[PDB]
């Protein structure tokens, strides 16, 4: 029961996602190698992974209908504030509930709770992060719901620093309408309502994970020997 406009929105987002996500994980061989050992031995590899992913988030966001028609300032604010949330969402594709890990084609590129620890983060982030990944995986989202959720996350009108909040809200409302209609096409009530509510809660969970990651990133990047291990893009996007 999707309108032509709603189908059009979904088609654009699926195209944007397929252009900005490579499921073979070929580029992972180009990062600084993982090392499981010296404090922060996984920070170089995981910083390169996050930096690479920020580029993908930017490439996806620029295809969201209307996003490039916002001011450059609002585009920058939206990407700086949502990048970490979208990375957490995008990572769920390779997350497996057997062993609470992220598999990316090889044993070198399989990440667990310990690797995130070896990038500098503590359990106050890692525990709720794993809980989020488990709750998201059990939703068994279709790719259509996945790309809509990431797009909704990016065009959030309540981000600090947004000037044209009404314009941002206009985009998000169209994405939300499309997601709700897609859910209704697949599920009768009340399962329709329960699934959408759980998706809303996951967006709320991501905001809490954002805050905690920001706290720990500020504590980590404050030390110049830690910032030395990051990338220029990570410093620019996550900075100030």
């Amino acid at each position: 029961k999707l309108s032509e406009e709603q189908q059009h929105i979904i088609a654009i987002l699926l195209d944007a996602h397929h252009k900005t996500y490579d499921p073979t994980y070929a580029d992972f061989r180009d990062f600084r190698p993982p090392v499981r050992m010296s404090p922060l031995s996984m920070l170089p590899h995981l910083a390169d992974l996050v930096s690479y992913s920020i580029q993908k988030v930017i490439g996806f966001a620029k295809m969201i209908p209307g996003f490039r028609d916002l001011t450059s300032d609002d585009q920058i604010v939206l990407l700086k504030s949502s990048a970490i949330e979208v990375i957490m969402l995008r990572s769920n594709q390779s997350f497996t509930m057997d062993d609470m890990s992220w598999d990316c084609g090889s044993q070198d590129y399989k990440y667990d709770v310990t690797d995130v620890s070896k990038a500098g983060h503590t359990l106050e982030l890692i525990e709720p992060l794993i809980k989020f990944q488990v709750g998201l995986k059990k939703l068994n989202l279709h790719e259509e719901e996945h790309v809509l959720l990431m797009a909704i996350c990016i065009v959030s009108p309540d981000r600090p620093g947004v000037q044209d909040a009404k314009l941002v809200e206009a985009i998000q409302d169209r994405l939300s309408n499309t997601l709700q209609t897609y859910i209704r096409c697949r599920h009768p009530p009340p399962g329709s309502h329960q699934l959408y509510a759980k998706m809303i809660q996951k967006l709320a969970d991501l905001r809490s994970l954002n805050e905690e990651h920001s706290k720990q990133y500020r504590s980590l990047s404050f030390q110049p020997e830690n910032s030395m291990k990051l990338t220029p893009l990570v410093l620019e996007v996550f900075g100030n």
Partner: peptide, 11 residues
């Protein structure tokens, strides 16, 4: 404001 690499990827 000061985000040349982000702006470049946005074009």
């Amino acid at each position: 404001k000061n985000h040349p690499m982000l702006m470049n990827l946005l074009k």
